[PDB]
Amino acid sequence: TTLRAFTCDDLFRFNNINLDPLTETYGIPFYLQYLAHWPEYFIVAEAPGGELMGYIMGKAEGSVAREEWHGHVTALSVAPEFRRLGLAAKLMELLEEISERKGGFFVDLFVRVSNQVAVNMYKQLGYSVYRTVIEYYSASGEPDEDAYDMRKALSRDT
Amino acid sequence: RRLRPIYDYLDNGNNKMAIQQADKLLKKHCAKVLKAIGLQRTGKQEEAFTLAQEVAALEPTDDNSLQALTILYREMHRPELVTKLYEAAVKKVPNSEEYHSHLFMAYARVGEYKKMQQAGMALYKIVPKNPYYFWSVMSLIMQSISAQDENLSKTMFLPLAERMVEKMVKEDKIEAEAEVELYYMILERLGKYQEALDVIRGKLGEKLTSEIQSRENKCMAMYKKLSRWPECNALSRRLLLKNSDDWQFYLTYFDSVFRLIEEAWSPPAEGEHSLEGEVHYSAEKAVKFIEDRITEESKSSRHLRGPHLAKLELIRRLRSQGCNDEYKLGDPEELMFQYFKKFGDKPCCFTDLKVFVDLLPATQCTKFINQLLGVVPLSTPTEDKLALPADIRALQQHLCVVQLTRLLGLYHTMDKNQKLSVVRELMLRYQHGLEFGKTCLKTELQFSDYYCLLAVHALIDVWRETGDETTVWQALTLLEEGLTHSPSNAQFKLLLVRIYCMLGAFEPVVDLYSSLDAKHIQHDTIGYLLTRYAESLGQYAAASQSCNFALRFFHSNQKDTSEYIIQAYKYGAFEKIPEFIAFRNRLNNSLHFAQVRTERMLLDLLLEANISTSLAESIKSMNLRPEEDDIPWEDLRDNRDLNVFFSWDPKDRDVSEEHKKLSLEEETLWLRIRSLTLRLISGLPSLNHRIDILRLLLQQLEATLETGKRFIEKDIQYPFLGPVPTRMGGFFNSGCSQCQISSFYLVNDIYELDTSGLEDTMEIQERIENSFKSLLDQLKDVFSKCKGDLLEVKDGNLKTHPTLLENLVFFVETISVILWVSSYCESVLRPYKLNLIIMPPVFTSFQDYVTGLQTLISNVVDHIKGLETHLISPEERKFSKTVQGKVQSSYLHSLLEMGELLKKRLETTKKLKI
Amino acid sequence: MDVFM
């Protein structure tokens, strides 16, 4: 597995990662904003021959001097033929390290409470649970799914 | 409070923003027209521009007016009108920072690179802040990546920028990170790699510690481009010792070690071997490192697959130079067998053993599989049944063995009976693999779905190698069962899209492509499956919706990526700007954008041209002229995916690079045919009141119709999961190329007769009569070739004919063009017959026969009466009655739409009877 | 995963 930075022209290649019922595509302005502002929290993993294994977006937007400078996790996916390898643990570890090096208090996360896989992954990595946003995920006719806001405090620093 | 109360209510939704603003005229300032137009610029452009341009010339110099106009101008795809505001607001007042910064942003938006540098320098001179002195340098590089391949790219623009940056490195005004990033960019661009490596390895690199490895990944590029190998090998091993799993560093480590063996490198006498220390020389020092990485990974609780692949990479590369000298790496067969033994129960055991499968001796591919099958914990075979797994681990360990038996080339040697016993076995295994994973959350794939895909890639194979047509239905029932059990597998939906399209049914294809949520960027890499077959199979509503979605995405792409290239200066990127520009160019030069544009224009034409709108009024509303094509033709991209389908085929018959090249070439040929037809059609209006342009497009079109016809003779055989050969091969069989060329010749002859007159043109009138009488005889031959039966019941099977539907869509697309051209000739003959004699009497017969032929074709589009009369495991015997019930109800929908279009088109022949 | 807009 090759852990590199998610360069554009890889947006034309995550079609084994983003063709899941739980992963979204977010449009091009979203990806370009997260590549321009925060290119550190945008790791991607690439198999031996091509085959994007799975990326992790992410941002760090808060306000220091109020204990709210947190490192978000605005996406996470692994290709369904590359799962159970320890890849998502690796990417989340990299995001925690990156958001700790720049002096962050806690890592945030929004996991829709329908899938027990992701929730039992974050409860095992160390993530506690914070408030449950009601009707968070908008749609896409289908119902709206409440979202656990998970928070993991790490190495308290301004 | 007139600026907040009246304005906050002036943006409520549409009308509370407009009515409260429209009522603000008699109520109270300088931007009321713009506020009203921002919500009333939906479809009416003139009523909006009459106030937009009215207020954009009054010297606004206001945040509200300027901010509203910079949105109104950017939304209408007219950014050039934006820059003329702030400079117009700058010439009156030399604003300190706000207006100058907005002017620089407007310049970078419109694209004026050589004009943004002066604005940036002026803004730096006004206030001496640091991030403004480097916007100038970034613009100075922007106006060097556009006009490349010249002396004014490494002698007039880049060296000036390097000097402008080094004028500040002498000082201490470079305390940042984007500054060092941009300086390294400029140093790498000029070619001073030896001088750019030191700006990182020295003191200005310590500020570059923001990304994960932005220092050891920027020293590596320079160590490579300088051909400095040992200081690359040392960095490779020093980054492997930290992870021991990165492939991108195993590759560079092996490259550098073998290049050092080639150069006969020797160490120095003093100090560490290179600038990074501990450089490896030969295979021994390169084999001990790998055999130590494997051991060190053996003592962890993570089970890395790095070293086990690295040893195979090394046993390949050593064999690529000297094969008789092997030390201890061992046979690649035993290595692959142990790698399967360890990482067998994971889904990624195939895509890691694939790339190294060339190491096998090419003859023991039937013994290696029999050796792999010995370790899977399978049950007893001869219980009057099959040998089945017991856990979810021993099922994946066998699914990988089946996939490897597929890739080694063993399901392609059997002959139509073993290749069906295999499908029977892989369906028994799939039906048994549903006992496990019975409690999946409906978003997790079943544990044996890839037993169905391997039983569909072996049915479509038999269908393509024997033309059976009794296996396509079996594959469709298999995919429908597998997609009702695990209704989130995207491979099932993609294969059902492909198979339904290749059978002629399209309605389930749109219902399945709306299921797998193909959102924005997907519209460029997966939407081609929809655009290729939407208007080809007669579905005009679905084709219109697909073209609309793709066009919406691409136009939003243009605007939004321009804005987010503006927004890479504010956050100090300076290293994504070339990347963002390359991305925006790769998305505007896409091969799918051109196809969607031309198909949308032709759909608009042949749906609402001369039916509910005149052809001239429908060409004016699309901005079409026969002398300008907004298609690159030289930078055409073809960024379709082509590898979204999982293909376990034997690595030499799935997708070559020659196949992708030929697919792009055929797509370009057919797109040129379609664009030339559109541009020729867009001249018939305004040809009556020049023909010297519509006579050159005819030469181009008849040259490209010969290039394509010689391409089709080059009989290329794309794989099933390949690039989907275009309609061009089916555009020449059912003769419609000549059937439209014989009309574009007739329009030329009619124009010549018009410019000459009906006085002494007895040689042109006879040619016009013969062209009529020979064009009708081709319009009848198209019908004779498209006459058939769209669904049979031959010997209990169904035997779907999709060619009789493609040749019936082409007939509608051809008589639409013939009716447009005929409505032109009526425009030239009506005034003549009014002014008052052998040529009009044959045009009248041509019209009275085109009507009598459209009636026949609109009565043979009464296959509805012959399709509605069709009658057509215990659960696999029920999904056939839904697969066939979908194909039938798709043919019926297609025939209904085509018959309705012909019934609406036949009425337009009442305006041609002269 | 966050919302799209």
- Per-window interface: A 92-121 vs B, CB < 8 A: 94, 98, 114-117
CA distance B118 to B140: 10
DSSP state at residue A6: -
Collapsing DSSP states into helix, strand and coil, what is residue B37? helix
Residue B870 buriedness (CB in 10 A; 0-12 / 13-18 / 19+): middle
> What are the beta bridge partners of residue A52?
A46
Collapsing DSSP states into helix, strand and coil, what is residue A5? strand
CA distance B265 to B282: 9
CA distance B510 to B528: 12
Structural domain boundaries enclosing B356: 1-373
Contact B233, B280 (CB under 8 A): yes
- Nearest CB among C1, C4, C5 relative to A110 is that of C1
> What are the beta bridge partners of residue A152?
A107
Tokens of B209: 């510690």
- Kind of pairing, strands A147-153 and A52-56? unpaired
DSSP string, B225-265: HTT--HHHHHHHHHHHHHHS--HHHHHHHHHHHHHHHHHT-
Contact A115, A22 (CB under 8 A): yes
User: What is the CATH classification number for the domain harbouring B82?
Assistant: 1.25.40.1040
The residue type at B483: L
Contact B246, B206 (CB under 8 A): no
Contact C3, A137 (CB under 8 A): yes
Task: Look at residues A74, A79, A87, A89 and name the one whose alpha carbon lies nearest to residue A127.
Answer: A89
Chain C: closest CA distance from residue A136 (Å): 8
**Angle at alpha carbon of residue A69, lines to A67 and A73, rounded to 5°:** 130
DSSP string, B422-459: HHHHHHHHHHHTTSTTTT--SSS--TTTHHHHTTTTTH
Task: Look at residues B185, B190, B191, B215 and name the one whose alpha carbon lies nearest to residue B202.
Answer: B215
User: Given a contact as 3+ CB pairs under 8 Å, which chains touch A?
Assistant: B, C
DSSP string, A66-106: TT---B--------TTS-SSSHHHHHHHHHHHHHHHTT-SE
Residue B791 buriedness (CB in 10 A; 0-12 / 13-18 / 19+): buried
CA distance B518 to B532: 16
Collapsing DSSP states into helix, strand and coil, what is residue A149? strand
Contact B283, B261 (CB under 8 A): yes
**Other CB atoms within 10 Å distance of the CB of residue B66:** 23
Q: Does any CB of chain A come closer than 8 Å to the CB of residue B520? A: yes
Q: Does any CB of chain C come closer than 8 Å to the CB of residue A19? A: no
Q: Indicate yes or no: CB of A8 within 8 angstroms of CB of B576.
A: yes
Straight-line distance from the first to the last Cα atom of chain B, in angstroms, rounded to the nearest whole number: 69
Q: Indicate yes or no: CB of A136 within 8 angstroms of CB of C4.
A: no
User: What is each CA distance from B534 to B374, B508, B517, B659, B806, in whole angstroms?
Assistant: 49, 12, 18, 23, 11
**Angle at alpha carbon of residue A133, lines to A127 and A134, rounded to 5°:** 145
CA distance B444 to A117: 10
**Angle at alpha carbon of residue B246, lines to B244 and B250, rounded to 5°:** 85
- For B390, residues 6+ apart whose C-beta sits below 8 A from its C-beta are B377, B378, B379
Q: Indicate yes or no: CB of A74 within 8 angstroms of CB of C2.
A: yes
The residue type at B529: L
CA distance B86 to B101: 9
What resolution in Å is listed for this PDB structure?
3.5
Chain breaks in chain A (C to N over 2.5 A) after: 140
Chain C: closest CA distance from residue A25 (Å): 8
Chain A: closest CA distance from residue B878 (Å): 27
Tokens of B675: 């664009």
- Nearest CB among A22, A23, A136 relative to C3 is that of A136
DSSP state at residue B70: H
DSSP string, B828-891: HHHHHHHH---SHHHHHHHHHHHHHHHHHHHHTT-THHHHTT----TTHHHHHHHHHHHHHHHH
Chain A: closest CA distance from residue C3 (Å): 6
Query: Which method was used?
Result: cryo-EM
Tokens of B368: 């290696």
Contact B120, B135 (CB under 8 A): yes
Residue corresponding to tokens 């799975």? A54
> What are the beta bridge partners of residue A3?
A45
Q: Does any CB of chain B come closer than 8 Å to the CB of residue A128? A: no
Task: Look at residues B375, B380, B304, B313 and name the one whose alpha carbon lies nearest to residue B344.
Answer: B375
> Which residue does chain B place closest to A36, by CA atoms?
B568
Measured between beta carbons, the chain A residues lying within 8 angstroms of B348 are 47, 81-82, 85
Q: Does any CB of chain C come closer than 8 Å to the CB of residue A137? A: yes
Residue corresponding to tokens 């009466």? B865
Tokens of B513: 């492509």
- Nearest CB among C1, C3, C5 relative to A23 is that of C1
The residue type at B850: V
Q: How many Cβ pairs closer than 8 A exist between chain A and B?
A: 143
Sign of the Cα torsion B344, B345, B350, B356 reads: negative
Backbone φ/ψ region at B467: left (φ over 0), alpha (ψ -120 to 50), beta: left
Collapsing DSSP states into helix, strand and coil, what is residue B821? helix
DSSP string, B745-794: HHHHHHHHHHHH-SSS-HHHHHHHHHHHHHHHHHHHHHHHHH-S-SB--G
Straight-line distance from the first to the last Cα atom of chain C, in angstroms, rounded to the nearest whole number: 12
Chain A: closest CA distance from residue C4 (Å): 5
**Other CB atoms within 10 Å distance of the CB of residue B321:** 11
CA distance B310 to B313: 5
Give the helix ranges, DSSP H, for B146-217: 158-169, 178-190, 193-201
Chain B: closest CA distance from residue A63 (Å): 17
CA distance B623 to B633: 20
DSSP state at residue A18: S
CA distance A146 to A133: 6
**Other CB atoms within 10 Å distance of the CB of residue B785:** 18
DSSP state at residue B57: T
Collapsing DSSP states into helix, strand and coil, what is residue A150? strand
Which one of A14, A18, A26, A112 makes the best mutation probe of the C interface by having the most chain C beta carbons within 10 Å? A26
Collapsing DSSP states into helix, strand and coil, what is residue B382? coil
Which one of A24, A91, A145 makes the best mutation probe of the C interface by having the most chain C beta carbons within 10 Å? A24
DSSP state at residue B799: -
Question: Would you kindly state where each structural domain of chain A is located, as residue ranges?
Answer: 1-158
Collapsing DSSP states into helix, strand and coil, what is residue B298? helix
Q: Indicate yes or no: CB of A19 within 8 angstroms of CB of B582.
A: no
Contact A44, A58 (CB under 8 A): no
- For B802, residues 6+ apart whose C-beta sits below 8 A from its C-beta are B502, B503, B504, B537
Tokens of B284: 């021994």
Q: Indicate yes or no: CB of B351 within 8 angstroms of CB of A1.
A: no
- Nearest CB among A13, A39, A85 relative to B576 is that of A39
> Which residue does chain B place closest to A3, by CA atoms?
B246
